[model samples]
Target: GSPEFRWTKEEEETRQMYDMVVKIIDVLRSHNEACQENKDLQPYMPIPHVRDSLIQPHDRKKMKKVWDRAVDFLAANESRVRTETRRIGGADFLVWRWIQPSASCDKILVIPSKVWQGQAFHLDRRLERPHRD
Candidate 1:
């Protein structure tokens, strides 16, 4: 059976936000891997660089909220999103390190196993089936 389905406004926004974070993570991974493959490259990519790569780049406030939410979701699931404990200013913090999907070729939108259904919203209906012509 085909897996075609629809999303309510809430669900649609949620999925879109999730995908945006994924794109951000992809940028982060590329930067990390590039440094790993080349000694002369900087060991870390700047936050501005990562933020600028995304469409309609987020402001610090919004990006921070979104980033933290994404991190929380990843923390709950054991998946490609990886993190490491970094000691900065004598304090320990969990920072995102990288993300590498097992099957790198088929990059696709990651629909979570569980999602909270929201208020149902109708998508624009298709045409051409009113009556016999």
Candidate 2:
């Protein structure tokens, strides 16, 4: 691929910061207490359109390999092939997300943090408040 795997120190830090976000939410979300906003800044319009997969009685295990596998899938499919070192899974990461709400106003927003080749990497951010203020 003869691509560039190069990245600024800032990029790594940025990536790590995302790591912090996912992990932190994992703890809080697992317990059904870390919903991220009164609404959102990503702020998807309309809160009750999406369905299924709500963090009910605390089941991180129920979520599946969920985050890690998703990350792996992203690195494998969407991560661009570097232009210098020529590899997959090294470039700008965690750039997008999709917000979905469950049955009880508990919401799930999957944060896509990376792209490799043809796939994307992201994690879910939970929220208790999604309103029309």
Candidate 3:
């Protein structure tokens, strides 16, 4: 849905942050694809949920920078973000607002899938045992 409220400084910043976050996600997807293609590269296994709680203090501090920027933007322009709300599969979802909470901190939303077709072919090749003739 389109934004419900008038354009505000905060909303402008929020839009910027949302765009940045989308870019980051795209970068991460590309990185995973690369890792899967190159066996030498380490596999991309998500960190355990609890491990997130024990992140290095310095690392956490650095991550806070992005969060703070998003939060500040959202806090100032909450109305603009709230304007765009939609219903998805019976649930009311605010596209912009959904991301506002993570503005202050990084979070992961896990979606379950039995098979990941994107990497299936790569997996088949890697899983095969080499046989010398």
Please report the TM-score between candidate 1 and the true structure.
0.35
Of 1 and 2, which scores higher on lDDT? Answer: 1
lDDT of 2 by residue, 38-107 (tens): 3323322111111112233456344344544434423422331111222236654323233323423432
Question: How far out, in Å, is residue 63 in model 1?
Answer: 3.0
lDDT of each: 0.45, 0.34, 0.38
Off by over 4 Å in 1: 1-18, 39-58, 72-82, 97-133
Instruction: Flag clash pairs in model 1.
Output: none
Total clashing pairs for each candidate: 0, 23, 1
lDDT (Cα, tens digit) per residue for candidate 3, span 6-78:
4665455466566434433443344444433333133222222112222445464444346445445434433
Candidate 1, poorest ten consecutive residues by summed lDDT: 99-108
lDDT of 1 by residue, 21-69 (tens): 6766565556545443333144333343444545553454456546556
Best by lDDT: 1
Query: Residue 63's C-alpha lDDT in candidate 2?
Result: 37
Candidate 1: lDDT over CA atoms? 0.45
Backbone clash pairs for candidate 3 read 4-83
User: How does residue 11 of candidate 2 score in lDDT?
Assistant: 52
